[PDB]
Amino acid sequence: QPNPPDVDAFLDSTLVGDDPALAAALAASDAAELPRIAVSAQQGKFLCLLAGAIQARRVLEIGTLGGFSTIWLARGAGPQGRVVTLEYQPKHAEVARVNLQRAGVADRVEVVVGPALDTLPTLAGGPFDLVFIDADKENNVAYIQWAIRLARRGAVIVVDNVIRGGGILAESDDADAVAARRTLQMMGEHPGLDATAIQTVGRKGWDGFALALVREN
Amino acid sequence: QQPNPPDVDAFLDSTLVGDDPALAAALAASDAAELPRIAVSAQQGKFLCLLAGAIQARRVLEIGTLGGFSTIWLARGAGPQGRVVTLEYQPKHAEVARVNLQRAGVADRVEVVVGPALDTLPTLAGGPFDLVFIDADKENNVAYIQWAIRLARRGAVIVVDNVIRGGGILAESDDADAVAARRTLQMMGEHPGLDATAIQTVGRKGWDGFALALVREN
Ligand SMILES: Nc1ncnc2c1ncn2[C@@H]1O[C@H](CSCC[C@H](N)C(=O)O)[C@@H](O)[C@H]1O
Ligand SMILES: Nc1ncnc2c1ncn2[C@@H]1O[C@H](CSCC[C@H](N)C(=O)O)[C@@H](O)[C@H]1O
Ligand code: NA
Ligand SMILES: [Sr+2]
Ligand SMILES: [Sr+2]
Ligand SMILES: [Sr+2]
Ligand SMILES: [Sr+2]
Ligand SMILES: [Sr+2]
């Protein structure tokens, strides 16, 4: 009788609690008619704790939407950390900037507007400690190649949505399952990466993520 | 037949891990000694390895060794200068694990400490620990987490295995590991020294999940 969404509601109440900044971000995202595809609270808290564990101070995110995952990354990187997040849609970037300011992390985050393949070669500063790749899935492999080039040795790369209900193994007419399957094959074969993939369930259904360490950059 | 999580894990194993004769030998030795086949899956073990590597862990504490499968992955992630202390109360499990760690080339990084963890944890001087993996008798998760906080550095990572148990944490069944998991999660959420999340997983081992926490303060 218990199902993964019910368990996630319990985990949210038990481990995350009331989050008025993310509640406001959801309402603002809804008012702007953004798709409800942001990370769940357990998933966002995972990104936050991952950034905190490695003491990430330079974080790259590809795919901002309304800034939900971005807020979590900025929380984990802390007041000394900086997050650069890339977003193709001007309307998404504008909502995210408002959501970031209301969550109190605007001093830590820059939203860079444009196709990520055009903005990544000009991104400056220093090498990244953590890269979260969550944009157009057909460019996952290009984004991972960029992540390796722009990350420090030992940086963490996280790729969202790599399982898609098992569609990566099924003759499924799902462009992003095709992309996710090729992404996993590329990560396994790449000599500069050491990677794992964890299948997940919860409020967003059966999916999963890839996590890799940059061996050489 | 549509793909299921075990099928997907087999693909992930073949694609991201590949042939691993050290872990193949560890499984075979564990089977030969009739250990329960309840080790972490390869994707789960690799996650522990990459987590230790990501935080550059040099002192790792594991509670619940079995045949050393999770231990091998932790030792791989800690590197040649890293050290793992792993606690096991069954002498036969400890003996199998020591053989498996040697064949995995990590015996010089790992100490298996034999005895009930509640009795050996106060004798440990191998800290402060950077990473604690809690995977032993579930009714003592909460005690082991309290010890982990005491023995860890600030900012250390604590991972607790098997905290979902097929959704049983929401049921009122006389189910020891689900009752313990629910209490474990409630304790972690309430502890002012911990910041925690829990991820539900599927795969070879079915619907389960893990808790991950940062030690915010000793
Ligand atoms: N080529 C591209 N470059 C940058 N962003 C892109 C892109 N293609 C799609 N996107 C953006 O990627 C986002 C994916 S949804 C991202 C969700 C977010 N990470 C969260 O969990 O809260 C969308 O906002 C979409 O506009
Ligand atoms: N009180 C206790 N102290 C130390 N070890 C204990 C214990 N109670 C149970 N155990 C041990 O905990 C182990 C749980 S199975 C551990 C599996 C292992 N972590 C892997 O993934 O490969 C068993 O070997 C069991 O004997
Ligand atoms: Na690889
Ligand atoms: Sr996503
Ligand atoms: Sr079609
Ligand atoms: Sr276990
Ligand atoms: Sr009983
Ligand atoms: Sr049970």
Author numbering:
A (entry chain B): 6 to 222
B (entry chain A): 5 to 222
According to the publication:
Mycobacterium tuberculosis (MTB) H37Rv is predicted to encode three COMTs, i.e., Rv1220, Rv1703, and Rv0187, which share 29 to 36% amino acid sequence identity. Here, we present two crystal structures of Rv0187 from MTB H37Rv with and without cofactors at 1.64 and 2.08 Å resolution, respectively. In both ligand-free and cofactor-bound structures, Rv0187 appears to form a canonical dimer observed for all known COMT structures, consistent with the results of our SEC experiments.
Meanwhile, the ASU of the cofactor-bound structure is composed of eight monomers, and each subunit exhibits the unambiguous presence of a divalent metal ion and SAH. At the initial stage of model building from X-ray diffraction data, excessive electron density around the modeled magnesium ion was observed in the Fo-Fc difference Fourier map, signifying the presence of a more electron-rich element despite magnesium salt being added to the protein sample. Since strontium chloride was included in the crystallization cocktail solution, the extra electron density most likely arose from Sr2+. Therefore, Sr2+ was included in the model for the subsequent refinement stages in place of Mg2+. Pseudobipyramidal geometry of strontium coordination is observed, similar to the octahedral coordination of magnesium or calcium in other COMT structures. In the cofactor-bound structure of Rv0187, a strontium ion is complexed by Asp-139, Asp-165, Asn-166, two water molecules, and Asp-178 of an adjacent subunit, which is non-crystallographically related. Located close to the metal binding site is SAH, a product from COMT-dependent methyltransfer reactions, where the sulfur atom is approximately 5.3 Å distant from the Sr2+. The overall binding pose of SAH is essentially identical, with slight variations in each subunit. The hydrogen-bonding interaction between the N1 of the adenine moiety and the backbone amide group of Ala-121 is universally conserved in all eight chains.
